Design a protein around this ligand. Structure first.
Ligand SMILES: [Mg+2]
Ligand SMILES: [Zn+2]
Ligand SMILES: [Zn+2]
Ligand SMILES: [Zn+2]
Lengths: 48, 113, 57, 61, 49, 67, 56, 263, 45, 147
RNA sequence: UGCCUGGUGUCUUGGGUGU
């Protein structure tokens, strides 16, 4: 049941490398992660 | 909230070509060039370099909107010359000018160091 | 105040959070950009879209 | 702990309390209130003692 | 002791200058929330008629 | 609140000149002469040091919330 | 954390704990009781940790 | 054909005169130096403890604006172009700050000299905060009183001033041409006489004033440009000029490659 | 289980959701929660 | 038409940047002799009609902790009110709803960092909390300025 | 195989914003 929901995550690739966030939506292969650094939420693939 | 990311001014998406060329059929031997993720820095340089070539009869550019980082350039040469060759000659000539400028500045700086 | 205060425009999606107008239409709306706000209403049918594009444009 | 036990512990530590800026300010305010009460009662003897105590406690930096 | 206390507190809290059960026909807006947006706004609010 | 790191208009670093500015003013130098001695030529930079109000000295007077 | 409890007097009674002899070989002592001593406030852990409880 | 003549030279500013170049080339060079020369600046702040009176993001914004030495930033890679998971030593520089006030009286100032470089690229002269001298304390970051502590870990990345103004190496580039207005590129507002109501340019002595009987020359173009480049200390003035030229060359070469590969 | 800080003497302690809301040593009625242990990161912009 | 152009680089360097604070209040109400509200992290099992936000940022006592980034509709105060139980005691293994959610969500359009959480008692001796949220507002297209 | 939630007072009053 999407075990990574509401868990702290870090981005390792792309334009947001090394930013801490929290996973909000876990439909599939496209995770919505809110960023702690600015006040916004972005989509991101699971591999990232 | 709706503010775009600042890196979108210069970071090119994979599906977006850096340089799209389409002919302008209203007048002979004319092309329209669309530069992506560029601004007045490259555009004005290219325009004022090309304006001095005897075989270039029309050159202009415009930035449609300040909130989007791209510009479109219109070039139109004589019958003998293909416009893309003129654009390449302009790029190479400006590169040589910058190279000799750098060399001379280095010489002067070493002299006055 | 008058019927030129409601007119139908064509949408263009843009960044940032403000409605943007060509400055020639600021006269019929009696609007300037010192803090004014304006209302946008979306038609929800083909008939209503045709009415807006053919009458209030 | 209960409320009464908390009050007892607080009173015990207040007895142990050598000094604390918040508590010193509270004590000085209470002394000023007592001094105005004595002034309104025209008690020229108590007011002298309260003034001496206030002078001793004060002189902050 | 509740009479005076509640009357004063109600009139100062709501701004209706009168008894609670006579809220209508009473002068309203006498008491207002202090404006603390900036120092000048507070100073202006404290000297308003 | 505290002296800005960079001048807003141009971007010169003025955040390292607050202490020197106060030292110069202490010695009796005038404000214009003090700003000139720090090599602040453009008036865009001069307004940054000239019109700065130091509020952190008032926030620091409150007792810290932790210990 | 617990010396000011009213029951702490009986709690500490009979307990075995490591003690600094000072005169240092740590040794164990048996609590025969406790006695509050007024005017003997001492730093317990920090400067603010004033304590009047004493262990016999 | 182009010529360069240096008037004054320093570590932080150079005043030079360009000649035999188009106005567009000089302006493009000025724009490139202002907003397209890569430098190194703090881009992520991890706040492990902050009990000061300043907000966390207040201090983060202040830290981002501190100039760092960016001499060897060419060897460094962009964060988005590094295949390493998380950040490695080849695409980031880690600095750490730890400040505390001891005693129950006085105020402690936190300066940029307290920023200590922990990790970075091997043997590359990057990351150290810029200091005017060996005894310069640097930029004032914060102030502390008793029992207030600041403990942070900052990561510096490579970027350009287009993305954020903190990566700009230059402060203000003075730019000027035609002091005597022989080209009539500007029309002078006046009340009585335009000649005595307008201050002379600082380079007015470098060009001969027009003769009283001289006619207007419609064949002339701006030919000599006077420009002063001031830096924030992250890069020397000569480095800024040379790297602006190199960046412009790289941009033009990229355009040329795109054209040649289009066919 | 969760730390707290007094509003006057800045003394750290803890509560068990059943103690009265009070500082153990000075009896103040106003207490504050302590900062989270999670990582806090900012973009420095 | 009364607009103005602002320098983006000056905005980047801190021109006209400001700080925004908003506080939320909540308290435990007393409805009877032994009907009280409780500050707690409600569970999907023992409570009914929960808010659509997320409760994962709450601590054990039902209050968020300072330093935590919050977004719109997140729950910053967890409160439940008792409800008379139904006949679910028939065959439910203690998993029957006895409490109703009365939590306080963050405003939908706002987000920021939890700055300071205050816990105390009201005049009546019940619990009483105040949560202050902090965010930074940078000038952008549409912000109003004046001389 | 352990499996995901949309449901938000009312009435007064005050202070504001654009014409
Ligand atoms: Mg208006
Ligand atoms: Zn300046
Ligand atoms: Zn890397
Ligand atoms: Zn306390």
């Amino acid at each position: 049941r999407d075990p990574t929901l509401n868990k702290t995550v870090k981005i390792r690739q792309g334009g947001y490398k090394g930013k801490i966030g929290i996973v909000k939506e876990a439909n599939g292969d496209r995770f919505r992660v809110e960023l702690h650094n600015p006040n916004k939420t972005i989509p991101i693939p699971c591999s990232f | 909230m709706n503010a775009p990311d600042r890196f979108e001014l210069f970071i090119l998406p994979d599906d977006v070509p850096k340089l799209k060329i389409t002919p302008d059929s209203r007048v002979p031997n004319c092309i329209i060039i669309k530069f992506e993720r560029e601004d007045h820095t490259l555009a004005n340089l290219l325009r004022e370099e090309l304006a001095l070539y005897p075989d270039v009869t029309f050159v202009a550019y415009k930035v449609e909107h300040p909130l989007f980082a791209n510009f479109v350039m219109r070039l139109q040469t004589e019958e003998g010359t293909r416009p893309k060759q003129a654009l390449e000659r302009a790029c190479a000539s400006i590169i040589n000018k910058l190279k000799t400028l750098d060399h001379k500045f280095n010489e002067e700086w070493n002299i006055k160091n | 105040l008058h019927k030129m205060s409601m007119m139908a425009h064509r949408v263009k999606v843009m960044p940032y959070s403000t409605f943007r107008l060509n400055l020639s239409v600021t006269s019929p709306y009696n609007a300037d950009f010192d803090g004014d706000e304006m209302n946008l209403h979306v038609p929800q049918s083909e008939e209503t879209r045709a009415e807006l594009s053919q009458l209030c444009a | 702990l209960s409320n009464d036990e908390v009050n007892s512990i607080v009173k015990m530590k207040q007895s142990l309390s050598s000094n604390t800026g918040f508590n010193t300010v509270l004590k000085k305010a209470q002394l000023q209130e007592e001094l105005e009460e004595a002034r309104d009662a025209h008690d020229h003897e108590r007011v002298a003692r309260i003034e001496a105590e206030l002078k001793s406690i004060g002189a902050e930096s | 002791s509740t009479t005076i206390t509640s009357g004063l507190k109600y009139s100062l809290a709501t701004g209706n200058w009168g008894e609670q059960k006579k809220a209508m026909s009473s002068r309203a807006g006498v008491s207002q929330v202090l404006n603390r947006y900036t120092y000048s706004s507070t100073l202006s609010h404290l000297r308003r008629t | 609140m505290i002296i800005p790191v960079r001048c807003f208009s141009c971007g010169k670093v003025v955040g390292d000149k607050w202490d020197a500015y106060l030292r110069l003013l202490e010695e009796g130098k005038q404000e214009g002469d003090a700003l000139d001695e720090l090599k602040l030529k453009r008036y865009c930079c001069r307004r940054m040091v000239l019109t700065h109000v130091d509020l952190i000295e008032k926030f620091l007077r409150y007792n810290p919330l932790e210990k | 954390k617990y010396w000011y409890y009213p029951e702490f007097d009986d709690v500490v009674k009979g307990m075995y704990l490591r003690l600094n002899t000072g005169s240092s070989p740590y040794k164990v002592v048996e609590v025969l009781g406790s006695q509050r001593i007024k005017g003997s406030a001492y730093g317990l852990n920090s400067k603010e940790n004033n304590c009047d409880m004493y262990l016999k | 054909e182009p010529k360069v003549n240096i008037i004054n030279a320093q570590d932080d500013e150079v005043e030079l005169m360009l000649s035999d170049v188009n106005l567009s080339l000089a302006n493009s060079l000025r724009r490139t130096m202002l907003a397209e020369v890569p430098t190194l600046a703090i881009d992520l702040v991890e706040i492990k403890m902050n009990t000061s009176v300043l907000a966390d993001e207040f201090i983060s914004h202040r830290l981002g604006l501190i100039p760092l030495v960016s001499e060897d930033v060419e060897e460094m890679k962009y964060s988005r172009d590094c295949t390493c998971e998380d950040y490695c030593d080849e695409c980031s520089v880690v600095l750490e700050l730890s400040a505390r006030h001891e005693g129950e009286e006085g105020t402690t100032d936190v300066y940029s000299s307290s920023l200590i470089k922990v990790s970075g690229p091997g043997n590359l002269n990057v990351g150290e905060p810029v200091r005017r001298d060996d005894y310069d304390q640097g930029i004032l970051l914060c102030k502390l009183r008793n029992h207030q502590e600041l403990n942070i870990r900052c990561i510096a990345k490579k970027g350009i001033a287009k993305e954020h103004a903190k990566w700009s190496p230059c402060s203000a580039i003075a730019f000027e041409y035609d002091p005597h207005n022989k080209l009539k590129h500007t029309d002078f507002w006046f009340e009585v006489d335009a000649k005595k109501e307008w201050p002379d340019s600082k380079y007015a002595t470098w060009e001969e004033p027009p003769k009283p009987g001289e006619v207007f020359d419609y064949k002339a173009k701006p030919n000599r440009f006077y420009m002063t480049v001031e830096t924030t200390g992250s890069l020397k003035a000569n480095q800024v000029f040379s790297r602006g030229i190199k960046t412009l060359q790289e941009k033009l070469a990229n355009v040329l490659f795109e054209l040649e590969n289009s066919r | 289980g969760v730390k707290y800080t007094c509003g006057a003497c800045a003394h750290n302690f803890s509560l068990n959701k059943s103690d009265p809301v009070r500082c153990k040593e000075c009896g103040h009625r106003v207490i504050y929660k302590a900062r989270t242990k999670r990582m806090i990161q900012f973009d420095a912009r | 038409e009364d607009s103005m152009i602002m320098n983006q680089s000056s905005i980047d360097r801190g021109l006209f940047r400001s700080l925004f604070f908003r506080s939320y209040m909540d308290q435990e109400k007393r409805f009877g002799i032994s009907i009280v509200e409780e500050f707690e992290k409600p569970t999907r099992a023992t409570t009914l009609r929960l808010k659509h936000g997320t409760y994962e940022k709450l601590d054990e006592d039902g209050l968020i902790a300072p330093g935590v980034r919050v977004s719109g509709d997140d729950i910053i105060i967890g409160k439940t009110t008792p409800i008379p139980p139904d006949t679910e005691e028939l065959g439910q293994r203690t998993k029957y709803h006895t409490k109703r959610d009365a939590s306080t969500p963050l405003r939908s359009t706002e987000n920021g960092i939890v700055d300071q959480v205050l816990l105390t008692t009201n005049q009546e001796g019940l619990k009483f909390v105040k949560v202050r949220m902090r965010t930074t507002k940078v000038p952008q297209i549409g912000d109003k300025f004046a001389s």
